[PDB]
From Swiss-Prot:
Name of this protein: Glutamate receptor ionotropic, kainate 1
Localization terms from the record: Cell membrane; Postsynaptic cell membrane
Subunit structure: Homotetramer or heterotetramer of pore-forming glutamate receptor subunits. Tetramers may be formed by the dimerization of dimers. Can form functional heteromeric receptors with GRIK5. Can form functional heteromeric receptors with GRIK4. Interacts with KLHL17.
Note: The postsynaptic actions of Glu are mediated by a variety of receptors that are named according to their selective agonists. This receptor binds domoate > kainate > L-glutamate = quisqualate > CNQX = DNQX > AMPA > dihydrokainate > NMDA.
Gene: GRIK1
Chain sites annotated for binding L-glutamate: P87, T89, R94, S140, T141, E189
Full-protein interval shown: 445 to 819 of 918
Family: Belongs to the glutamate-gated ion channel (TC 1.A.10.1) family. GRIK1 subfamily.
Disulphide bridges: C201-C255
PTM sites of type Phosphoserine: S161
Primary role: Ionotropic glutamate receptor that functions as a cation-permeable ligand-gated ion channel, gated by L-glutamate and the glutamatergic agonist kainic acid. L-glutamate acts as an excitatory neurotransmitter at many synapses in the central nervous system. Binding of the excitatory neurotransmitter L-glutamate induces a conformation change, leading to the opening of the cation channel, and thereby converts the chemical signal to an electrical impulse. The receptor then desensitizes rapidly and enters a transient inactive state, characterized by the presence of bound agonist.
Extracellular side: 118-255
Residue numbers carrying Phosphothreonine: T197
Annotated glycosylation sites: N2, N202
Organism in which the protein naturally occurs: Homo sapiens (Human)
Length: 255
């Protein structure tokens, strides 16, 4: 408990954001959000100090054809970060190469679209071509479709990848702008959809959850921190703190 832990993260509202201030902010103070509040709580419970670095390449983490990982996942593999604290989705393929705490938040893939249409499910998207749909390129949602053996999701992946230049987007902001200004539905995690729909009363989640998973803190395989982090997350849940943090960043208060 002396060396400063390096934490890798990624910009994604309301998890991780640049704090605004009339005066200059330095180091960790530049960042705010649900995950920064979480990290602070974890650091208090476990008694460590930390240095927040964005993932250099700006990516969550995916495998290329040669099987090579990038993004926050690779930062951990290569021991360039001690922890990843982000909306980092716990997946089977990632568990092969990094360890995750128990989840601090649960979510599933769902659909962000506008209100007032006859679209009620992924099946409604899949059976037509007029409304475009896609996902953020190279994250867990995209990979879910790429790897699905379910007929509907296979059809959807065929659509997304055949029209990849338009259907797949670079980040959440691009995807939301597409929903706002074109006839487009974004495949998106339910937690992130909820943030958006609270802030724009024209937008809605369409249908239910397409899968069921969690965000967890990532560590390099074998890290002693992983189980300690799980214990801390369990404590925060027990204390009602995870609920309070969600309400602070999704609803409003407090503050
Ligand atoms: N959390 C995902 C990344 C991503 C997704 O693939 O869904 C990218 C971006 O997509 C929109 C929304 O789901 C947000 O939480 C982000 O999650 C991951 O860990 O790969």
């Amino acid at each position: 408990a002396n060396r400063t832990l390096i934490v890798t993260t990624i910009l994604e509202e309301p998890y991780v954001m640049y704090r605004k201030s009339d005066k200059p902010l330095y180091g960790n103070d530049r960042f705010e959000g649900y995950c920064l509040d979480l990290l602070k709580e974890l650091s208090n419970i476990l008694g460590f100090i930390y240095d927040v670095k964005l993932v250099p390449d700006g990516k969550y983490g995916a495998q290329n054809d040669k099987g090579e990982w990038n993004g926050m996942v690779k930062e951990l593999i290569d021991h360039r970060a001690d922890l990843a604290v982000a909306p980092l989705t716990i997946t089977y393929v990632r568990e092969k190469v990094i360890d995750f705490s128990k989840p601090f938040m649960t979510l599933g893939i769902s659909i962000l679209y506008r209100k007032g249409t006859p679209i009620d499910s992924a099946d409604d998207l899949a059976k037509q071509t007029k409304i475009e749909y896609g996902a953020v390129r190279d994250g867990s949602t995209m990979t879910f479709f790429k790897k699905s053996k379910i007929s509907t999701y296979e059809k959807m992946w065929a659509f997304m990848s055949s029209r990849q230049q338009t259907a797949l987007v670079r980040n959440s902001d691009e995807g939301i702008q597409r929903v706002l200004t074109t006839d487009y539905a974004l495949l998106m995690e339910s937690t992130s959809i909820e943030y958006v729909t609270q802030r724009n009363c024209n937008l809605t989640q369409i249908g239910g959850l397409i899968d069921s998973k969690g965000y967890g803190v990532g560590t390099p395989i074998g890290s002693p921190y992983r189980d300690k982090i799980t214990i801390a997350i369990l404590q925060l849940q027990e204390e009602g703190k995870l609920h309070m943090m969600k309400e602070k960043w999704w609803r409003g208060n407090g503050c």
